[PDB]
Ligand binder design. Sequence first.
Ligand SMILES: Nc1ncnc2c1ncn2[C@@H]1O[C@H](COP(=O)(O)OP(=O)(O)OP(=O)(O)O)[C@@H](O)[C@H]1O
Lengths: 497, 984
Amino acid sequence: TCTEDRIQHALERCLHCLNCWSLQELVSRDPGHFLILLEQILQKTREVQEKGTYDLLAPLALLFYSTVLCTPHFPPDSDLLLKAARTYHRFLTWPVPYCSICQELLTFIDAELKAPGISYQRLVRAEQGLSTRSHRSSTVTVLLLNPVEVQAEFLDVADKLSTPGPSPHSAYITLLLHAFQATFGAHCDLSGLHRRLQSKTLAELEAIFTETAEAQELASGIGDAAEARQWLRTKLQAVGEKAGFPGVLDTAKPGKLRTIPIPVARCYTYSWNQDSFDILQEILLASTLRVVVFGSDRISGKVARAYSNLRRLENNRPLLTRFFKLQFFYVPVDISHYLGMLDPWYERNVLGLLPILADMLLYYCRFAARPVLLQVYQTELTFITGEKTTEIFIHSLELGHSAATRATLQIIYSKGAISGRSRWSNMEKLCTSVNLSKEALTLNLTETSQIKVDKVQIIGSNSCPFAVCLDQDERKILQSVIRCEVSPCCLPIMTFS
Amino acid sequence: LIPIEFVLPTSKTPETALLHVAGHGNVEQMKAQVWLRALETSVSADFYHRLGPDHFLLLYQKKGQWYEIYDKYQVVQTLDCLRYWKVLHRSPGQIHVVQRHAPSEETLAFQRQLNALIGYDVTDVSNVHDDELEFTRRRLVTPRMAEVAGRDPKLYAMHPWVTSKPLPEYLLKKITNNCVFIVIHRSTTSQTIKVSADDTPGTILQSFFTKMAKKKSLMDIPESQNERDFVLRVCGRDEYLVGETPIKNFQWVRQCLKNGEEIHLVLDTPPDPALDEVRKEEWPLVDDCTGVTGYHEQLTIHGKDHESVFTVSLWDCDRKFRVKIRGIDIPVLPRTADLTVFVEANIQYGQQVLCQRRTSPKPFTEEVLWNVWLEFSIKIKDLPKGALLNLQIYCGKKAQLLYYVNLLLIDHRFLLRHGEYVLHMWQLSSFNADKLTSATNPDKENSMSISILLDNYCHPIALPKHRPTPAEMPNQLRKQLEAIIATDPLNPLTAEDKELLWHFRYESLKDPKAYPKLFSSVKWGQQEIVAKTYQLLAKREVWDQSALDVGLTMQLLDCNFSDENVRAIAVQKLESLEDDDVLHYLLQLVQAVKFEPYHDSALARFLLKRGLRNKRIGHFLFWFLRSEIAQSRHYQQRFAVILEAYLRGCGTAMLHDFTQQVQVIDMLQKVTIDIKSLSSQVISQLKQKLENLQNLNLPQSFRVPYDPGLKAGALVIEKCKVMASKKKPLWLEFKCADPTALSNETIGIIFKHGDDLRQDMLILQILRIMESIWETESLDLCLLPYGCISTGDKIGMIEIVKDATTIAKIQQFKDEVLSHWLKEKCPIEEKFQAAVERFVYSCAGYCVATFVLGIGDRHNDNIMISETGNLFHIDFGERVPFVLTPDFLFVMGTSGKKTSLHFQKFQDVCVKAYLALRHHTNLLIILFSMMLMTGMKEDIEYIRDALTVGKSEEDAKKYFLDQIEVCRDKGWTVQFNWFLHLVL
Ligand SMILES: Nc1ncnc2c1ncn2[C@@H]1O[C@H](COP(=O)(O)OP(=O)(O)OP(=O)(O)O)[C@@H](O)[C@H]1O
């Protein structure tokens, strides 16, 4: 057909930016598109399994998650879930992380099959915070943007996201609509359900929602898929009878399935002029906490700085962790290039950068799961006054006449080789400028030359005054130091793969 | 949930806890789970808190024997303890969680002695990236135990040396009227008695103690002790003659008859069996079911849901094999030159390279990094059990190889490799036995290291065990099949021939001689083809009742056969050999263990139970393993474990005897050092050291290394010396330590340093096997195979032959010297004629032997002759068939073109021997090959072009006669060459 052919072409432009978003917009036109899209994606999965390709298993696993979550109803005739489960059941033998990824998908399919719509209600319920007492959870989206540097285009997105459109009464209505349609299909009277729920007060809507949510969770703990769905249908049918609209469900005349979208999450906004994340602690005056730092090229380093700086600050002095479970998300307006060579899927969607961006950003935050740990270098700085400090630097380090303008010393060094066999050396030198340029590093000694080095130690000469800057810092400068030892080294940043 | 009772250590009486554990839960989880129960139930929680789950052992009794579950990465359901309990209807069983203990003083002391004897610390765990060796040490206890406790005490203490072969032709004559005379000695009364050559020693006594019953007073035998309280013994040796065998089926009697010397025996008391007691074992018995993982029907994900998946069968995988090469790093560049280098990885089975790969050239600097995936066409489910990942560095500007190293893709557990490995590479300075080595270079200081990544998997990828499961061709094909089965062993099989053999696989099985050709055609890189073969081998009744042909049973233990079932039947066939047969192929079974790709195999286990059942196999087994440990880095650890398992079973008697021999070898090594490190002062210094050494508590009596029945005693210092050799060997001369010796002859030995004598024990083990061949035809070519042995790092203990002299000296080229020399030594004509008899019967034996083996062309200076006329070669470091200088034929009655009554009896004899060997062409061709590889193909082509494989008897019977003549023209020119270069 024309529609089916177009979907296949679009799905290619996403397996090869706005292309992935365009795919979601096109398939959201009608409920039938999702099932058609599911088969086409699943067909490409079989080719991978029959050729052993690796680079195209990360994308397909995400799309399948996305699409099943959006899809309103699964007709009993079509068993595409069983087809998908068998296709991924033969991936357990692949090497890590591929085997690990597909094991999660198998768990995702089991919950959906035994209790349809369980996944979608879980996600939105946490986002809106309307979690029942028996199962409490929450997710809070907190942006940190600098109007001075961030363009107003991104600020408007935060403004639109920060606008609280959905209300707690509306959210309970929407979730109940999704729960009933997902199991009863076109036999449910959507207009009848919507009209009769509107008159319901907030208390009864929450109480009814509590009963339905508990039933679905119990259903997922049932052995046989067929019996589990049957048990849910009986329970859902009974709930409708008790609620007072049994005729709304199980209508003999089929209706038209309505594509229920995903409501926007609880987003806030704050001015990130100061890179130190103390402001996040100020916002205070396991549930998740979504951090969405924006970044620029220069603030990339100070991003890393505050990032790792607050990270270990909490590791030892945990304050926020007591209320949430932090999860960080970088967004470009050094870290760029890092994820640009390590996560191509992250490169196309986010690095390539309601309005389009707000929908793109909301998708980014909702399904990104793979943590990333950045490379850092730990340094110990010893002064002459009996004071010692510990710092973390990644970008570079400079010292001397050149460094001072921008903003004898004993040298010990210890290179090593891949095998764990190294060569310590004691080569003290006199120069007017010493710089460490970046995993290993490459020292600099403007006497000019550059030398590969992995671990270094520099010692001063009888309180010789000198200023040292970390990562070309313009404020944190240490003067008249006596020693500095540099060596290579939850709330991590998130990537799709 | 499977219930199990655990007997907790502390109580008033020991306390027991009943715990239900998952059938597929791991043992380590059971340790933690049991720990929590104790803490919840303990009457004294402090005792179970300070301790930990990793400081205990889980013991269980099986038929009165305590067993311990050595492996920890195992599921409960797989334990043999569950199987044993359920068969006996015990549930829940008892598992004793006994606290571990540190080694005691005696145990540490005993281990110290063993480590010194072996020459290697078996406890070392430094240069190992796996736990195979320690598992082997624990598991080889079961072999030993039963054999140690299945021995006959008296026969094992006395160890009679019997044979079963029939008497040859040239010894039936020497038993006239079926009678033999034995000179029985008792104190000072040495009287001769006559018995029948088919009488057992148990009888020779009966008659003796009846004849002399009235005259027992003269004999001085104790009156109370009867004819059962004594045993005959060879006078001057520790070789008893006991048991129930004919007095003609011993090996001392047959040696005397060959030399025409009366048999001298002395009555003696039986050696006490109490002197062979063994130390009770310290280790518990490892669990029996450790090498078994399960069938493909239980290790496969298919047919199961992700909920219960724990193990993944290898055959379920279907991906192309893949490795990641990171790079290499040499600490200091050996040479600074403008050359490029590149790595390559190959998969292999035996010498068959299933697939290869390579990487782009890069400059050869002190550190090269690639970090590249290499993906091989072979599917991961096509990997056989003995796959060998071979990493090799090649160089270039062809390609000069520099380094190689090997890894086992399926380790000793049936589990694919997974992780990061950094491996140090050997350095090569076509093929060899050393190149199949799965050992990593211990020189971790200036050796290249290469880093490889093999992908990790969420579950263990295990190799399952095969399940035993259940007209005539056209005459042309049958005739064509017969031709292939009947070619020389070195002959290759073409692909078309392989299809015929593999297609006709159930037709050849019934023919026992076709096995080494059937299995050379199976395609091992395909799961089903190997699966078909196992079904084929399920029924092998033909090969289980076919005459044993050591030539065939040796063919299967070569390199090519890397299988576990093909090798296991061959070894099963070797389990027929008799002690006499075993002693002839020892140094060739031991030197063939270098091919078993795993440590604990059936060959190695066979080598030890034969050892621990007989004393004379153990003695020589001790010395052949001991030499490999001390001078072959590539196979030290495998051989160290093997020897340790034996040394714990031999006994305190032989252990004392093995200590004393090692001291003398080590002290004399020091003495060699002194003189070598630096002119009559050399002689004077030797006397001082030797006199000091005798004063240095040198053992008063030790068994000679190469003759267990001969106990050399106090040194004789006036006859020792240092020859005029650059290596300066010691002409040591000892004397017997047995008062019953009937002669005052000494015991000469040469202790030599500066050369490797592993070859000499081969080209002298081969000949002794050829001597047995020419005995299977009742021929007695009179070779002189002397004793020799290699004991360590370029040191050797050669035996001295009394009354010998080198031809180079009987020439210090005048032609007539040789003949006059023998005349002078034995002017008596009768002795001279008898002497020239031997000089011919043995100038052939050596013309033959050194021509078949391809080492005929030798210098005059390396040939000798005993005074009784016996020629013999020594020092086994344009061509000639052999050394047959005119002088030799001069002594046969020949000169110019004449033919003497002896010259013809030489040619007659010569050929009459060659044709005897041709009847064993297969054996000579398997043993030549084995030697070569495991010793030092165009090289191995010599043993056919010269053993006449192909043409028929007449075509050969004229082959070697033409050779004998070829030499008759050479005369004295080749020897010129030799001495010429050796003097220039
Ligand atoms: N088994 C033996 N019995 C008696 N004498 C022997 C024996 N083997 C060697 N000899 C004597 O020892 C000397 C040869 O010793 P060996 O074989 O170590 O030679 P080498 O001196 O090392 O060799 P080269 O000729 O290359 O200098 C000769 O006198 C030979 O007679």
